[PDB]
């Protein structure tokens, strides 16, 4: 019902090596160019890769800042008011990066600001500009 | 099996049904109840086992009777007609037994036997037991035919047939008990030997002879699961099979590291587009630094937009350096994946030259056992013989196999050198016209009732006829001589002073150079006690190595077994004989193989009689009158000895029926 285990056999494929009496050889050698084909195709993209892996030489190390440990904070300086409304033009409505210039106010208590400070400090307007951009 | 019902597989019958055989005989127990079905069975079975139980002695049917009992002894015409049955077929009492009920004093009829070879021997000594005149024509100076044995001094060695393949079921083990030959066993271990002269190691040799077993059976596949058997009109053979599925290997081989390089490009440039996003985001964090830099440099105190200019860019680098980081685990992943897949290669091949070589020896093993070239081999229908054959161990004949057919000629009426040349058949009888071999001058006419031809395959396929047939045969019987095949093996005798060899080994091999010499003495016999060799000659190389002198073949014989064991191990062999069935004229090849384009159909339209036109127009239809017997005529046991001898045993029946009556049908 089944051909031998390690025999592969497919109506398919014996219909293709039988259509002529080379259709055999035409077939394997085929698949034997269509090999070379793929292997230096290989070689080749192995060699850009290793090109653009040395243009990357020492990493991002130089480049890198000291992370600063800070203790999270309620109180809202005017200082701390101001860097906020200039990350809002600059970030919109991505809390984590606005979280992350202020410093000492995480996540949360930036949303707080976009709705007690709303009136004051004209959110809505800077939302807008930063909208067309 | 044991019993009764060992007699019955022991005689190739089923032990609980009635054969075809039994249903003609017997048409009245066949239709009627069951129970009468059984007691008919044990009736055979019983009367089987009696005379298997010791074959060296007529069985009489009043010896059998004595030994039945009841309430099988109580219907004495079953017993009778059951033992009448078993005795004309050959079933019981056939071979060299001892006669209990001496001949008649006058014969009824006479037969003409073409051939005395086994299978002509065995029908003589069944008609000659049954009553009749028989006298056996035989070209050669000896009996045997095929049965060919070699004997100088104390040197013995088979040209023919040289095996019996198993005592479970075969005919020649009743023959063994009733002529004594030295039945020897044949250890199966076959050490290859390379063309360079030493072992094949036998990590190879297991993986080549399963992968032979599996190519075979991936045959079976292509021609009973796929009906691959037509091919351009023409049938397909196996030799064709085996390439197209050599052919589908090496193709799925391909396939194979095709997808498997092909999933390194996938991972090789998911690379490289994984390392343009790190050039440029390596070089937007090369910017960003500056500017953070050059912002930090505006020293304090400053005005809050500067004070943000600093706190920007720098969360602005640091999500880039997040960024570019992600996308090191990453470029750390598919570096080892690449290391995984490009260290798990596939098979680079599917056989080596080296592979390939021994391979090509199997396939002579396979052309040896079938006297012909894999290519002439019928795929359908090569192997349809294989459900019958025998259990237990092949043997071989210390004495030399020729010992079985003379034993068989005692009492018989044989003219040598005696070659038949025309066979002549009418409504009335029959003339068959031979001439002497010494010299052809001497012309010989012998009439008879009815004629056997055990003629050899070849014979018949001769063009132009060596014997001819008047009136000509039918149609649809030389259509069955040109279909069928009549295959070619030879064997080299080298006769030695000492043993040089493994003892312990009956045989070894040697692998070809080439596919198309892989035949050329790719195996050496060694079972004699004495020191003998033989070494076979199989497939294509069979009738190509005809032309060539045996001063050549035993030279090339030589240095193969100097390579094998020593150049200075081997001295030159005291007697050499190399056999050449293909150019013997009363054979013209060994024995038959089921070729393309043939089927098992063909062995039974060979085994057909022939019957004769009526002489006057309007006379009733004749008796037949020519019959025809030998190994290619038993469609389930040829190409044998065992099938002659049965074959023989099978028109002696059906002579005798014809022209002595069979009186157990009522």
């Known amino acids: 019902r089944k051909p031998p285990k390690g025999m592969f056999l497919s109506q398919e494929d014996v219909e293709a090596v039988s259509a002529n009496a080379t259709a055999a050889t035409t077939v394997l050698r085929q698949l034997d160019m269509e090999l070379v084909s793929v292997?230096?195709?290989?070689?080749?993209?192995?060699?850009?890769?290793?090109?653009?892996?040395?243009?990357?030489?020492?990493?991002?190390?130089?480049?890198?800042?000291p992370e600063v440990i800070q203790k999270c904070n309620a109180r809202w300086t005017?200082?701390?008011?101001?860097?906020?409304?200039?990350?809002?033009?600059?970030?919109?409505?991505?809390?984590?990066?606005?979280?992350?210039?202020?410093?000492?106010?995480?996540?949360?208590?930036?949303?707080?600001?976009?709705?007690?400070?709303?009136?004051?400090?004209?959110?809505?307007?800077?939302?807008?500009?930063?909208?067309?951009? | 099996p044991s019993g009764v019902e060992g007699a019955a597989f022991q005689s190739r019958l089923p032990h609980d049904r009635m054969t075809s055989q039994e249903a003609a005989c017997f048409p009245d127990i066949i239709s009627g109840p069951q129970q009468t079905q059984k007691v008919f069975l044990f009736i055979r079975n019983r009367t089987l086992q009696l005379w298997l139980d010791n074959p060296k002695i007529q069985l009489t049917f009043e010896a059998t009777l004595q030994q039945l009992e009841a309430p099988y002894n109580s219907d004495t015409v079953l017993v009778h007609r059951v033992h009448s049955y078993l005795?004309?077929?050959?079933?019981?009492?056939?071979?060299?037994?001892?006669?209990?009920?001496?001949?008649?004093?006058?014969?009824?009829?006479?037969?003409?036997?073409?051939?005395?070879?086994?299978?002509?021997?065995?029908?003589?000594?069944?008609?000659?037991?049954?009553?009749?005149?028989?006298?056996?024509?035989?070209?050669?100076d000896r009996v045997g035919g095929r049965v060919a044995t070699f004997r100088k001094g104390n040197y013995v060695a088979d040209l023919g047939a040289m095996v019996v393949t198993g005592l479970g079921g075969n005919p020649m083990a009743v023959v063994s008990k009733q002529v004594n030959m030295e039945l020897a066993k044949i250890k199966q271990k076959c050490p290859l030997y390379e063309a360079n002269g030493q072992a094949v190691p036998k990590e190879k040799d297991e993986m080549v002879e399963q992968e032979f077993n599996r190519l075979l059976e991936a045959t079976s596949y292509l021609?009973?699961?796929?009906?691959?058997?037509?091919?351009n009109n023409k049938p397909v053979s196996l030799g064709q099979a085996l390439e197209v599925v050599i052919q589908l290997q090496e193709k799925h081989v391909k396939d194979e590291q095709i997808e498997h390089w092909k999933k390194i490009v996938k991972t090789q440039e998911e690379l490289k587009?994984?390392?343009?996003?790190?050039?440029?985001?390596?070089?937007?964090?090369?910017?960003?630094?500056?500017?953070?830099?050059?912002?930090?440099?505006?020293?304090?105190?400053?005005?809050?937009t500067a004070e943000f200019l600093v706190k920007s860019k720098h969360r602005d680098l640091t999500a880039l350096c997040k960024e570019y980081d992600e996308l090191?685990?990453?470029?750390?992943?598919?570096?080892?994946?690449?290391?995984?897949?490009?260290?798990?290669?596939?098979?680079?091949?599917?056989?080596?030259?080296?592979?390939?070589?021994?391979?090509?020896?199997?396939?002579?093993?396979?052309?040896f056992a079938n006297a012909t070239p894999l290519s002439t081999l019928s795929l359908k229908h090569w192997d349809q013989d294989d459900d019958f054959e025998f259990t237990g161990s092949h043997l071989?004949?210390?004495?030399?196999?020729?010992?079985?057919?003379?034993?068989?000629?005692?009492?018989?009426?044989?003219?040598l050198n005696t070659a038949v040349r025309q066979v002549r058949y009418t409504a009335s009888g029959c003339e068959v016209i031979a001439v002497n071999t010494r010299s052809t001058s001497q012309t010989f006419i012998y009439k008879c009732d009815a004629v056997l031809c055990t003629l050899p395959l070849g014979v018949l396929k001769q063009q132009p006829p060596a014997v001819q047939f008047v009136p000509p045969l039918p149609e649809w019987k030389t259509s069955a001589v040109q279909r069928m095949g009549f295959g070619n093996l030879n064997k080299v005798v080298l006769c030695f002073?000492?043993?040089?060899?493994?003892?312990?080994?009956?045989?070894?091999?040697?692998?070809?150079?080439?596919?198309?010499?892989?035949?050329?003495?790719?195996?050496?016999?060694?079972?004699?006690?004495?020191?003998?060799?033989?070494?076979?000659?199989?497939?294509?190389?069979?009738?190509?190595?005809?032309?060539?002198?045996?001063?050549?073949?035993?030279?090339?014989?030589?240095?193969?077994?100097?390579?094998?064991?020593?150049?200075?191990a081997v001295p030159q062999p005291k007697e050499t004989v190399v056999s050449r069935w293909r150019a013997d004229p009363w054979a013209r090849g060994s024995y038959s193989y089921v070729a393309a384009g043939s089927s098992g159909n063909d062995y039974d339209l060979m085994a057909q009689p022939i019957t004769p036109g009526p002489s006057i127009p309007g006379a009733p239809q004749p008796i037949p009158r020519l019959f025809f017997a030998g190994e290619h005529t038993i469609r389930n046991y040829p190409a044998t000895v065992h099938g002659a001898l049965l074959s023989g045993l099978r028109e002696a029946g059906r002579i005798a029926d014809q022209f002595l009556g069979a009186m157990y049908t009522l």
Request: with cysteine.
């Open chain 2, 273 to 304: 587009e994984l390392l343009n996003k790190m050039v440029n985001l390596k070089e937007k964090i090369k910017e960003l630094h500056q500017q953070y830099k050059e912002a930090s440099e505006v020293k304090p105190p400053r005005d809050i």
């Open chain 1, 39 to 65: 292997k230096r195709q290989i070689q080749n993209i192995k060699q850009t890769n290793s090109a653009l892996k040395e243009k990357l030489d020492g990493g991002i190390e130089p480049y890198r800042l």
């Open chain 2, 87 to 140: 005795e004309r077929h050959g079933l019981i009492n056939f071979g060299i037994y001892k006669r209990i009920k001496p001949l008649p004093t006058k014969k009824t009829g006479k037969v003409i036997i073409i051939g005395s070879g086994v299978s002509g021997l065995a029908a003589a000594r069944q008609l000659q037991s049954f009553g009749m005149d028989v006298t056996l024509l035989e070209a050669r």
């Open chain 2, 497 to 568: 002073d000492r043993v040089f060899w493994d003892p312990s080994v009956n045989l070894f091999g040697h692998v070809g150079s080439t596919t198309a010499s892989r035949g050329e003495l790719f195996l050496f016999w060694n079972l004699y006690k004495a020191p003998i060799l033989l070494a076979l000659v199989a497939g294509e190389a069979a009738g190509i190595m005809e032309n060539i002198s045996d001063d050549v073949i035993v030279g090339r014989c030589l240095a193969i077994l100097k390579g094998i064991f020593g150049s200075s």
């Open chain 2, 396 to 415: 071989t004949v210390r004495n030399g196999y020729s010992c079985v057919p003379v034993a068989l000629a005692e009492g018989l009426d044989i003219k």
């Open chain 1, 78 to 133: 005017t200082e701390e008011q101001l860097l906020a409304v200039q990350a809002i033009r600059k970030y919109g409505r991505d809390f984590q990066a606005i979280s992350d210039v202020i410093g000492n106010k995480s996540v949360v208590q930036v949303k707080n600001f976009f709705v007690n400070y709303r009136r004051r400090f004209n959110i809505d307007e800077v939302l807008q500009e930063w909208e067309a951009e």
């Open chain 2, 328 to 367: 090191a685990e990453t470029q750390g992943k598919l570096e080892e994946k690449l290391q995984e897949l490009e260290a798990n290669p596939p098979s680079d091949v599917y056989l080596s030259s080296r592979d390939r070589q021994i391979l090509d020896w199997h396939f002579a093993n396979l052309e």
């Open chain 2, 223 to 231: 021609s009973h699961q796929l009906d691959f058997n037509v091919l």
